[PDB]
Amino acid sequence: ATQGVFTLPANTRFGVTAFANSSGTQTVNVLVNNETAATFSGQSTNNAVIGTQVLNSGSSGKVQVQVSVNGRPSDLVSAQVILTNELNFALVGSEDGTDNDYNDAVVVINWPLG
Amino acid sequence: ATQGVFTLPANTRFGVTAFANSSGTQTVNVLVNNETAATFSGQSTNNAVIGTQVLNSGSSGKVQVQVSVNGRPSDLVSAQVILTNELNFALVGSEDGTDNDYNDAVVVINWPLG
Amino acid sequence: ATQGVFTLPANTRFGVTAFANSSGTQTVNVLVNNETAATFSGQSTNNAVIGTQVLNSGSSGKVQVQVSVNGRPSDLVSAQVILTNELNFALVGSEDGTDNDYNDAVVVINWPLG
Amino acid sequence: ATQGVFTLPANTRFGVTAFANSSGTQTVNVLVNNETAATFSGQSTNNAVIGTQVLNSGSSGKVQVQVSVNGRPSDLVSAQVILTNELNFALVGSEDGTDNDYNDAVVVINWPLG
Ligand SMILES: C[C@@H]1O[C@@H](S[C@@H]2O[C@H](CO)[C@H](O)[C@H](O)[C@H]2O)[C@@H](O)[C@H](O)[C@@H]1O
Ligand SMILES: C[C@@H]1O[C@@H](S[C@@H]2O[C@H](CO)[C@H](O)[C@H](O)[C@H]2O)[C@@H](O)[C@H](O)[C@@H]1O
Ligand SMILES: C[C@@H]1O[C@@H](S[C@@H]2O[C@H](CO)[C@H](O)[C@H](O)[C@H]2O)[C@@H](O)[C@H](O)[C@@H]1O
Ligand SMILES: C[C@@H]1O[C@@H](S[C@@H]2O[C@H](CO)[C@H](O)[C@H](O)[C@H]2O)[C@@H](O)[C@H](O)[C@@H]1O
Ligand SMILES: [Ca+2]
Ligand SMILES: [Ca+2]
Ligand SMILES: [Ca+2]
Ligand SMILES: [Ca+2]
Ligand SMILES: [Ca+2]
Ligand SMILES: [Ca+2]
Ligand SMILES: [Ca+2]
Ligand SMILES: [Ca+2]
């Protein structure tokens, strides 16, 4: 099944944050309506934040997270969770190797903001 | 129902990151085994990371998130989500006022790390 | 925080299924746009399905689950989870006593159907 | 990533319920410790509950959901969510064709019971 794709409400501000837990450098791309809206790159084995940004979901609401290490696409796992019918999290895990911890890059998208 | 309390696997490192979306200064307290392990404070209406730390769940695995604004306990909502039977997120939202956006402080706990 | 309230897409069919795990008879009311759309009652300590129905979300898409036992409203816990940006689950547990298993009635809403 | 596989606490009762939303006959198999513990089959475009059962997770606690149509394995999606640190749902969707609604068989596992 496709993973790392989420339909947000249109024209909404949202936060995107990425963490790294790998000896490899993680590159995280966030596409909005199929155009790169944020790119984070960094390396950590201690859950360091490698980037955070505020974005707007635009007219489509379509947000996609992609992860690669040295040009190789990581395998993704994802889900969206809504608390009290208001607070939204779109969560992404990624695996760059063999151990299947799926934490190599971790991406959290939250809305609403403000 | 109790919110913002999670049983993690014992003796496990976990990430805890807090975001602010409110006029009010948010104070996030993270307890492990009922003892304060981290305190974040900050103010933003643009989802600024007001703190991020790596902690250990210790022998109990009992982790609790509290949020207060100027001393007043915020109302919490929470859940845990597990992807591919491996990647864990504990999520907390909090409301300091009347608008019920539940984003005033947002706390994300993730494990495993490394 | 309010629990047991979910905003579905408007004019969309959804499944609702209730399960009981208590010595007391459980009454589950499902409201659509603030009007009773279905009512289920049953007693089980073995997770028996005490009711199932297909309903329409109507123009608001607002769906509310209420649970009571012998007249007394149960304490509710809820969340919505979306998998592969497509498959929606609205989940409710409820507590009628002191043991805090929150399974005394369990209500599962799923969409889309067909 | 592996989908439809869940680690439960050992020797615990859980409910499993399957729903169908397809013109094809769905076969849902539930494995405990890699052995078939329940089987449900049926065809519905209206969210019929094609089966519900109470099982015991056994000594491993490993539970797996498999779905097929006419012997062809369906693509699965899954997650686990925990409410008030107590109430557990393991959720599975499955796709038998090309439209990617992932609702063709839906399976929900809940614990604890009683
Ligand atoms: C620490 C370790 O990092 C990787 S495994 C690691 O990946 C790099 C990528 O550049 C090299 O291929 C090494 O040969 C590999 O050992 C993570 O997948 C793993 O979970 C762990 O965090
Ligand atoms: C921007 C706004 O912030 C608060 S409402 C705000 O709360 C502060 C708390 O110190 C004072 O009560 C102000 O008088 C209030 O208006 C959030 O609850 C709200 O969601 C929004 O982010
Ligand atoms: C078996 C038991 O059922 C209840 S406790 C039970 O509640 C009924 C009403 O539902 C009466 O108040 C009795 O006096 C109580 O003992 C559940 O709360 C519990 O989890 C367990 O399933
Ligand atoms: C109603 C429809 O059913 C299938 S698509 C459907 O699958 C059967 C399987 O036996 C045949 O291949 C038909 O030729 C196909 O049209 C679902 O995938 C779809 O979501 C929808 O529920
Ligand atoms: Ca890895
Ligand atoms: Ca890793
Ligand atoms: Ca607020
Ligand atoms: Ca706010
Ligand atoms: Ca109870
Ligand atoms: Ca009970
Ligand atoms: Ca389908
Ligand atoms: Ca279908």
User: Domain holding B98: CATH number?
Assistant: 2.60.120.400
Residue D49 is part of which domain span? 1-114
C112 preceded by cis ω (within 30°)?
Answer: yes
- Annotate D51-114 with DSSP letters as a single string: EEEEEE-TTT-EEEEEEEETTEEPEEEEEEEEETTTEEEEEEEEESSSS---BSEEEEEEE---
D42 touches chain C (CB under 8 A): no
- Annotate B23-87 with DSSP letters as a single string: EEEEEEEEEETTEEEEEEEEEEEEEEEEEEEEEE-TTT-EEEEEEEETTEEPEEEEEEEEETTTE
Judging by beta carbons within 10 Å of its beta carbon (0-12, 13-18, 19+), is residue A78 exposed, middle or buried? buried
Strands D72-73 and A72-73: unpaired
**DSSP one-letter code for C71:** T
d(CA C24, CA C19): 13
Task: List, in order, residues 6 or more apart from D82 with CB less than 8 Å away.
Answer: B79, B80, B81, B82, D88, D89
Q: Is C99 helix (H, G, I), strand (E, B) or coil?
A: coil
Task: List, in order, residues 6 or more apart from C98 with CB less than 8 Å away.
Answer: none
Q: Tokens in use for A47?
A: 């859950």
Q: Give the closest-approach CA distance of A45 to chain B in angstroms.
A: 5
Mutation target for C interface from A57, A64, A83, A85: give the one with most C CBs within 10 A. A85
Phi-psi region of A86 (alpha: psi -120 to 50; beta: other; left: phi over 0): alpha
Ligand 4 touching residue D69 (CB < 6 A): yes
C111 touches chain A (CB under 8 A): no
Looking at this protein, which amino acid is placed at residue C37?
A
A112 preceded by cis ω (within 30°)?
Answer: yes
Resolution in A: 1.9
d(CA C75, CA B1): 7
Name the residue at shortest CA distance from atom 4 of ligand 4.
D22
Experimental method: X-ray
Q: Tokens in use for D55?
A: 């099982």
First to last CA, chain A: 33
C1 touches chain B (CB under 8 A): yes
d(CA C49, CA C108): 11
Q: CB–CB of B101/B107 below 8 Å? A: no
A73 preceded by cis ω (within 30°)?
Answer: no
Number of domains in chain C: 1
Q: Give the closest-approach CA distance of D79 to chain A in angstroms.
A: 8
Give the residue carrying structure tokens 């981290």. Answer: B38
Ligand 3 touching residue C45 (CB < 6 A): yes
Looking at this protein, which amino acid is placed at residue B24?
G
Question: Using the beta-carbon criterion (under 8 Å), do D75 and A1 form an inter-chain contact?
Answer: yes
CA distances from C12 to C8, C113, D6, D53, D107 (A): 8, 9, 30, 28, 20
